Design a protein around this ligand. Sequence first.
Ligand SMILES: O=C(O)c1ccc(-c2nn(C(=O)c3c(Cl)cccc3C(F)(F)F)c3ccc(Cl)cc23)c(OCCc2ccccc2)c1
Ligand SMILES: O=C(O)c1ccc(-c2nn(C(=O)c3c(Cl)cccc3C(F)(F)F)c3ccc(Cl)cc23)c(OCCc2ccccc2)c1
Lengths: 264, 264
Amino acid sequence: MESADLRALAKHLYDSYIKSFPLTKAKARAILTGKTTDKSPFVIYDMNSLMMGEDKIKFKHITPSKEVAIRIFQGCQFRSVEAVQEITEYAKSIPGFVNLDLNDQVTLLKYGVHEIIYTMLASLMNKDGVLISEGQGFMTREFLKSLRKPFGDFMEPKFEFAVKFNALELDDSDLAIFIAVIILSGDRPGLLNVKPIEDIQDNLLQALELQLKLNHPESSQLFAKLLQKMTDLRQIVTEHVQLLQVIKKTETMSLHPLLQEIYK
Amino acid sequence: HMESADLRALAKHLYDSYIKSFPLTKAKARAILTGKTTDKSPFVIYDMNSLMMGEDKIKFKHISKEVAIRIFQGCQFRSVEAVQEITEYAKSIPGFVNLDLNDQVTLLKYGVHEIIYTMLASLMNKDGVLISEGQGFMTREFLKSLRKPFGDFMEPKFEFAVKFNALELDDSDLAIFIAVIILSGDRPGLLNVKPIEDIQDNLLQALELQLKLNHPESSQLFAKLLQKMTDLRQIVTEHVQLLQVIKKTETMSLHPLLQEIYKD
Ligand SMILES: O=C(O)c1ccc(-c2nn(C(=O)c3c(Cl)cccc3C(F)(F)F)c3ccc(Cl)cc23)c(OCCc2ccccc2)c1
Ligand SMILES: O=C(O)c1ccc(-c2nn(C(=O)c3c(Cl)cccc3C(F)(F)F)c3ccc(Cl)cc23)c(OCCc2ccccc2)c1
């Protein structure tokens, strides 16, 4: 493709990225750094401030169970279900995606949303915590990591990944292409027609390659390093699923079957 | 960043070292597998009878035992030879022997297995694998049908090789790819990540140039090749988890070299 074509693809995905997701990376950076002297976020650092925070921000996943670590865990689910729809709608704007076989569209989203949620979560994290509720709350890493039994071990790898991933210093225009590449992976099991998916992903890769050289001209092999990250993501997604397994085996949680179906 | 003539020079140096370190190249393996030549023709092992003949015809460097064990011990003896050859090749990678000595050990520890699988693909097609420096050929069917846990042990190698070989890399490409794997600054416990990444950055530049010149019509071969370093990460873990099972069922001896590598 000609370079103006790639530049157009990049700006199309960036524009669509901005409209699809509730809090961009640029905004989240302004919050985490204190740069905006605007309203400081409500900080959740312990049990009492989690109580006060629910009552203040009036969270939408409230009145679920009772144990605090569980409540937090299930609010991670609530946000993930939301994220899934946000990525699904973003997908529709990747050139060519809607023209794929409907089953292949569903297969790509199904196996990809986990990796994308991990990635975008890093935009909302620093070494000390994570923005929640469109940047209005900030929940500390230490309070998450110190949750009881397995829940503490479940939250901390997200921060461990995010800190490493954020060292790349990608911005939203970088991430919008990167997200698209993940979605268009032709190696997802059960794809009926791999060829047009790789054809799209090749245009996306070309666009990401050129976007990274223009936007990070002094970051050698940033393209390569970012693809290596896409390696890890596969691994962390697998570790993650084997960790949701133990909780359902050991703790076994909610009862409302309808609720469980939404989170199926 | 380097000048192109310096990148071409590093590719030539690496290809020359690979030829000196690895006696059975992909080019020689492909000539044996394609045939159309009388002198290079392998004896084929597809069942117990041909295995028995096989040991009377081709010179196995691997001496009353049950057959799957006997084949297992054949691979591990050959894996140890491969570690030896890979170690010698690593030392030729510029900058490698100047790294901290425990980093050298750590990079080999986590890198040899990924390299063995990569170079095993050169010896394979969909129907089986070359053995004993190309003097023999053992069918995939025969390995797949071995008993207990040993049949399902041999088979994931073949599944990776068929996918990897679709890239159609030759030895000059593989020589630089093998090096990129070794100089991975993300291995657990590395003490000086930075000088390792500076070497890999150079190796990645060399691979990028090499793949564009040698495969000028292969869109995003670079990106696709880097995405294979993913699967590799997962088949290595699947391998060591299978080796874990066999230990608890078999008493099969592990070479001291391999015994130390498997250890965390
Ligand atoms: O806003 C956002 O874009 C956002 C996207 C994600 C999380 C998140 N997901 N998650 C997961 O385990 C997870 C992952 Cl990664 C991927 C797929 C599925 C799941 C899940 F859940 F289903 F298992 C986390 C684990 C730890 C942490 Cl710290 C965060 C997450 C997110 O956390 C906000 C959580 C929260 C808690 C209390 C109140 C309000 C919000 C925000
Ligand atoms: O020539 C070569 O470069 C070559 C490199 C590797 C194998 C190989 N290793 N291997 C392993 O299990 C293995 C791995 Cl990958 C890595 C570390 C440790 C081990 C092990 F053993 F300790 F557990 C295999 C499993 C299945 C298959 Cl098909 C091949 C391998 C290789 O096998 C064929 C050679 C052979 C020699 C004598 C008798 C029978 C076969 C050749």
